[PDB]
Structures are given as C-alpha cells and as structure tokens.
Amino acid sequence: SEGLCPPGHHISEDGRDCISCKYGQDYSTHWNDLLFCLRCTRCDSGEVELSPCTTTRNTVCQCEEGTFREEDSPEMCRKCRTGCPRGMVKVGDCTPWSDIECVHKESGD
Amino acid sequence: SEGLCPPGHHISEDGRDCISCKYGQDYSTHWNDLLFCLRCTRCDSGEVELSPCTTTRNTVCQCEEGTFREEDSPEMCRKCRTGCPRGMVKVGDCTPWSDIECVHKESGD
Amino acid sequence: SEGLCPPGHHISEDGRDCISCKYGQDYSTHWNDLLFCLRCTRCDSGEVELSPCTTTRNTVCQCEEGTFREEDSPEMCRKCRTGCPRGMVKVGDCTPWSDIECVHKESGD
Numbered sequence: 001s002e003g004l005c006p007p008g009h010h011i012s013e014d015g016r017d018c019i020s021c022k023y024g025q026d027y028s029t030h031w032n033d034l035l036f037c038l039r040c041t042r043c044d045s046g047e048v049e050l051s052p053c054t055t056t057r058n059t060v061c062q063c064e065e066g067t068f069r070e071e072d073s074p075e076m077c078r079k080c081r082t083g084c085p086r087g088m089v090k091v092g093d094c095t096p097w098s099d100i101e102c103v104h105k106e107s108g109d
Numbered sequence: 110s111e112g113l114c115p116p117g118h119h120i121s122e123d124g125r126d127c128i129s130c131k132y133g134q135d136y137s138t139h140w141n142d143l144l145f146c147l148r149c150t151r152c153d154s155g156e157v158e159l160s161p162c163t164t165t166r167n168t169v170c171q172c173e174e175g176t177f178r179e180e181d182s183p184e185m186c187r188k189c190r191t192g193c194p195r196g197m198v199k200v201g202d203c204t205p206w207s208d209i210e211c212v213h214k215e216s217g218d
Numbered sequence: 219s220e221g222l223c224p225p226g227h228h229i230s231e232d233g234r235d236c237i238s239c240k241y242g243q244d245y246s247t248h249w250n251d252l253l254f255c256l257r258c259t260r261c262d263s264g265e266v267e268l269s270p271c272t273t274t275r276n277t278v279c280q281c282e283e284g285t286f287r288e289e290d291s292p293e294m295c296r297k298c299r300t301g302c303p304r305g306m307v308k309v310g311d312c313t314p315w316s317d318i319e320c321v322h323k324e325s326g327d
Contacts (some may be wrong), residue, residue: 073292
C-alpha cells in the first residue's frame with residue numbers, strides 16, 4: 001500500500017510529503033506510517049550493548065548471564081533459580097530475559 | 110507499526126523494539142510479537158542429538174540403536190525385536206522410532 | 219538388586235553403580251534415581267544464609283535488617299520506614315520478610 005516512509009524518515013498526514021530525522025534524535029527501524037520518529041533505547045550498568053542506534057539501526061540491550069527479566073519487573077534482571085523446587089530437576093538454560101526450566105519426575109509417586 | 114518480529118527475534122515490552130536471540134539459548138520458528146524467545150530442546154543420556162537448534166532451528170532427539178519410539182508414546186524408548194517367533198521372517202529395518210517388520214512365509218512344507 | 223538410591227546419593231545411567239553426594243556441593247531430601255543431585259541454595263550479596271544445606275537439608279535465604287520483602291517477590295528487599303507519616307505512631311517491628319507497622323492515636327483519656 002501507499003503512505004509509507006523508509007527507515008530514518010517519516011511521512012506526513014496527507015502522505016504527499018516525507019521528512020528526514022536526525023541521527024541520535026529518534027529512529028525508525030521499519031517503514032513508518034506516521035509523522036513522528038520513534039525513541040531510541042539506551043542501556044545501563046549490568047546490561048550489555050549488542051548493536052548501535054542510528055536512523056537505520058536500533059540499540060540492543062541485553063542482561064548478563066545468571067539474571068532474568070520478567071514482565072513483572074521494569075528494565076530489571078533477577079537471579080535465576082539457584083535450585084529447582086523440591087522434587088524437580090535442572091534441565092533448562094537461563095536467558096537475560098527468560099528463566100531456567102525445572103522438571104518433576106521422582107518425588108512422591 | 111504492526112508489532113510483528115521475524116523468526117529468531119523477540120519484541121520488548123514496549124512493542125517498539127526487537128532484539129536478536131542467541132544460538133542455543135532460545136529461538137523463534139514463526140513470526141511472533143512477544144518479549145519471550147522460545148526455549149531450545151535438550152536430550153538426555155541414552156539419546157543423541159540429531160540436529161542442534163539455532164535462532165531459526167529446532168533441536169531433535171535420537172535414541173540409541175536397539176530402542177524404539179512411536180509417535181503414540183513420547184519421551185519413551187523400548188527394546189526393538191531381533192527376530193519374530195518361529196514361523197515368521199524378519200524383513201524390516203529397526204529405527205530408534207519404528208520397530209522391525211515381520212512377514213509370514215508359505216514356502217517350506 | 220534394585221534401581222533406587224537413598225537420599226544424598228545419585229545413580230549412573232547404567233544403574234550398575236551409585237555415587238555419593240556431599241553437603242554444600244548438592245543434596246537430596248527423598249530417595250531418587252537421577253544422575254545429578256538436588257542443587258544447594260545460595261544467597262546473593264545483601265542476603266544471608268539462615269540455615270546451611272547438608273547432604274539431607276535445604277538452605278534458606280535471609281535479607282539484612284532495614285530492608286523488607288514478601289514471599290511473592292523474587293528476592294528484592296526494600297527499606298522499611300524509619301518514621302510513620304506526620305501525625306502517626308510506631309508500634310510494629312520490621313523483619314527482612316515483613317514491613318513496619320504504623321498506628322494512629324495509641325489511646326485517649
């Protein structure tokens with residue numbers, strides 16, 4: 001369809017005009033259909049930067065191994081399970097965003 | 110924006126950012142729009158890894174020779190038959206998933 | 219004779235032998251038949267171990283005085299109030315698990 005602007009640029013309401021956005025102000029990752037540019041993400045200590053932010057790129061935030069990010073916490077990472085629940089076993093990997101996996105097999109019938 | 114992310118990627122809670130997932134830590138097979146990355150599958154002793162997983166692949170498990178596993182019973186392997194009782198003839202190959210094949214012979218007496 | 223190992227011991231994949239697990243490295247509360255032993259619980263900086271884990275026991279974590287946390291939270295602790303709002307009274311104690319308690323007008327005459 002029409003009314004779309006390439007990355008780093010945005011299109012007006014009337015769709016007959018597109019304006020350029022400045023490096024570092026705001027960015028667009030995919031063809032945008034708005035008059036504004038999206039805010040760029042920044043990282044803080046305890047987190048690792050994987051990719052740069054630019055009119056054609058987005059900054060990536062990642063958390064250090066051993067910690068996890070749950071939807072119940074804001075830009076925070078928590079220590080993964082330090083021991084599966086009583087009657088379970090270790091089998092899953094912990095990702096800065098997801099938690100470990102525990103499985104029940106031998107513990108009361 | 111629609112809010113969809115390609116395979117191997119996830120979208121943060123804010124819906125305006127998409128981040129890459131690490132090989133073996135987790136992946137996505139089909140287009141998704143969540144802050145979660147799909148966990149990778151692991152196999153246990155007695156079973157071998159047929160194909161490791163990546164940001165665009167799923168891990169498969171294998172059973173050692175002499176065992177069998179039908180789609181009707183997962184996470185289970187059973188001893189494959191080495192020869193049908195007298196009267197039957199072995200003619201099929203045994204695969205960690207399927208069992209041998211036996212056919213009745215009219216020849217003889 | 220059997221395929222079971224007592225608490226504090228794990229068994230090999232072939233079941234022909236069982237290896238002993240030692241306190242502080244891992245433990246088991248009930249009989250089991252696995253290759254690994256149940257992990258011992260450790261606490262992060264700012265938290266203390268209330269009770270260590272032995273070959274037959276599990277370790278509990280505690281948070282330092284002045285901070286508080288509910289069982290519903292992962293393991294974060296918050297600073298208890300050192301003075302109820304203006305026109306309030308102090309009457310409850312703050313425990314790393316519980317928060318301070320404030321009351322209005324102790325008693326009249």
